[PDB]
Amino acid sequence: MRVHTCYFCSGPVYPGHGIMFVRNDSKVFRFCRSKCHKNFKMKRNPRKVAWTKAYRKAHGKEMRNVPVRYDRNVIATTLNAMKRVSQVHAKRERLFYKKRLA
């Protein structure tokens, strides 16, 4: 199972929820919600929407296809690495928000 990213809302896409669209150029687009799908159908610019994460990132308000053999030790190490990375990212986001507020 892979959690796709929304094309408009730039958010995670879970099975059963959201809408998947395929273009003529073999392009796959995911909408996090009905409003995001409606905005995509209305040709709304992702960077021109306040609630969209794309605009938040590019406005100063925010900061593997190669097969690999399975390894239990690597997976166990990656389990703690993901938590450490998330904690570091949360701390960095909090620092960025504090700097932006000031």
Added chain:
Amino acid sequence: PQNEYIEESIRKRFDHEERKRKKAAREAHDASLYAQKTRGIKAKLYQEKR
């Protein structure tokens, strides 16, 4: 095979002969039972034939 293949196979179940003998002995009883149980136009046709 070809042509009368079924006839050729016959030329080339044995219990049917025993079954036929049993049916032949029961034929006398079967004819009486069928005639007595027949109803409608079929009963009249069977009686006329007999």
Added chain:
Amino acid sequence: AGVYNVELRDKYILQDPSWKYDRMPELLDGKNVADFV
């Protein structure tokens, strides 16, 4: 036919037989673990 259970893990070239018979994480905390490992 139609009731026989066929397991794809048996036809594996994994070094560890236990690892081949054991599933791996796919998605965790909203992130695709299988696609990010």
Added chain:
Amino acid sequence: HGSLGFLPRKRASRQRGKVKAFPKDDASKPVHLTAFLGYKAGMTHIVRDLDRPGSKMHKREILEAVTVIETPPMVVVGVVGYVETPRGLRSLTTVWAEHLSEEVKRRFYKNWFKSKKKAFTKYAKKYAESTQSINRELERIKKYCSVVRVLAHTQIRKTPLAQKKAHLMEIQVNGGSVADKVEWAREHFEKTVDIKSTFEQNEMIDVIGVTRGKGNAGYMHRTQLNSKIYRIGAGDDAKNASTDFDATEKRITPMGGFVRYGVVENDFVMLNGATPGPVKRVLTLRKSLLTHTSRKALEPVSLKWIDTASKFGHGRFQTPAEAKQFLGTLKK
């Protein structure tokens, strides 16, 4: 209305699902309970691979419209003796447990605040004062009975439900001898049993319940069939909504509690499909009358990932926890 099997259509009085037919039992069968009362927590769809020979999706992951049913462990607080009579099945004597909760005692009292709340109070007296009378009642049941059923009351207090009167259902102990059934219930008197003990979740459970009142539209008891359980998650288990694939811990309760029910705190049973009756309704999960051997029952459940998107309201994430770092730091 074409099917006269359900016509004429009249609303069923008892909200609790009634077991009009309990499963048949034999001495070879071990003594066990056949029914367990549950509450309609929710029925969101969760993904799960299908390991089924000949399946078009053999070994392929499938999102399934499953159903979570809140199942607080049932408490057996009495027994009934049923004598086989040429005019039917008669109740010989009923031997209750010595002590009863206020909730089950409340069931008898329409108001419960009336004057004295005397439910089985003298009965509790004569129970302790004369245990020999209960021994004779047990002896009479073992000597002059064929069908032994146990009085069971609902632990609504664990559930987030306003109703205080504990729903009492006469679950039938099945298997073994009549004395064995009486002995099991006697040793289990004033004791609770989880549904995980009653059902193994690989078993095919024909849950029955009363359809909701549409506003005679609806409100009729119905018996669902061919509903194999998928996960009897216990309430203490916070990994219940976290399968092996989605190992990250997540409670069965999704974000925003449950629709018109609130969060789940006690044991639950996961089962595909839908059942009659609204949310948080007393649902009779019971043993299947027929030991159906369909490949769906034969195949085990290997749940891929539990959906925990928002209940009442709308949620685009499995849990807020992952969404906390997923979105940027909030204004707060």
Added chain:
Amino acid sequence: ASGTKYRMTLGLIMNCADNSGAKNLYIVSVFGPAASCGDMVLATVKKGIMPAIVVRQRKAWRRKDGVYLYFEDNAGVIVNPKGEMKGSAITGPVAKECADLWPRIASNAGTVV
């Protein structure tokens, strides 16, 4: 033929993805009315009655799990009445049912999706 019909988006005007000289093949009738994504159905050439497996379907097709995917348009790849793809090569995504309905149609397809 091959495969079992499944409940999916009955998208397939059925654009003739197969290179039969027709860009679009309006579905005249459903063989065996609408055809799911990858189901061959009689189609009279709209632009540019023959079977037309819907390689691409505009309507969202619920996947195996239930993942609904909507293609750009309801494109029904042209298939001969025998079952093989009438066109030399199908274009765009090719539905899995189209592969089941006609392996040649999937074979002719440049893209299989």
Added chain:
Amino acid sequence: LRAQFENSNEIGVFSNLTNSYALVALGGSENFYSVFEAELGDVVPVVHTTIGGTRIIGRLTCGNRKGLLVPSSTTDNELQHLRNSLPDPVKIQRVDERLSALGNIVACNDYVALVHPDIERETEEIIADVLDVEVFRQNVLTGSYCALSNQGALVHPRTINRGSDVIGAGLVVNDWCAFAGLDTTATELAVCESIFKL
């Protein structure tokens, strides 16, 4: 090996036979998969993996003997499972190209691949590098139309599988053994065997 999966003679469409491993697809007959296992399965693993849940994934499988450079449309979980299922010597890769039916598009003979005329050069080169077979961009579905193998599967009439124009779909040509469907003509099968030095 002129054998048809169940009643379907599209052996190449069902299985992308290659010298190292036959990229078969799930959903085929178990006996046919065993028949493919008996014919060339020992030399060429015939594990039936439905790339992207497709029973005709063998048509679209762009993975040759040296490299399993199948298109990225193949399921990642299946590809990861196939990576553990198959030996690491096969350069398994996900060809993220618009033409998801790259295997049908590319006549990936083990000696030299033949990509579609409109196939991306970078995608063809990436498939060529893994397959260790020089790609040749040249119906567009070169792999589907004509069966390709190092041993040699001749060429389509424009024909294997009872004169079917899609020889590659009908015949699963591999360097170890140029398999085909049961409907393949005796003259066509003999010609393919003669082309394959067999």
Added chain:
RNA sequence: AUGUGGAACGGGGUAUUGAGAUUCUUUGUUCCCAAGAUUUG
């Protein structure tokens, strides 16, 4: 029907909304309170 009481508010959460507001829940406040008549037994 003298209480972990029930209920209404002060609210808050949930979501809605797309910086703002709203509405199941609340160790907060108060109302309510051994809450009266009728009916039989």
Added chain:
RNA sequence: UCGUCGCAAUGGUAAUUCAACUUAGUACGAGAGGAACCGUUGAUUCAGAUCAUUGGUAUUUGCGCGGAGCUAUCAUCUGCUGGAUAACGGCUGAACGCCUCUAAGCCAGAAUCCGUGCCAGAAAGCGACGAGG
């Protein structure tokens, strides 16, 4: 008198199913045809439904959206199964020393019937159970 938890006199009944790919180009069949066979995928029509999630929602009169929930397979469930038999086929076996499905009988066997399951229950059908002097 008020409740608890049950038995069931009596009715009604439902799922009809096929359809298409394997199971099959399967045994058998010179071969064609095609069994047995096995699951899966769905679907014709009709019945009880949940209303989770989603679409609609629609005085939240909150902010076109639209909460809380309702309706909608438009989100989803979803429709049982063991005997006795009809025709017919047999075993036993007289009548009619044998023979003879039949006459005493029995078995197999229909989409048939009966029960099972389901829906109710007999406002005056009952049992156990707690609480008028």
Added chain:
RNA sequence: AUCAGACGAAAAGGUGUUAGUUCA
């Protein structure tokens, strides 16, 4: 008599019978 009896489909069929007559 599984369409008893008590109150034309009727011609016949009865390996359905009860009694008797004739030839034997």
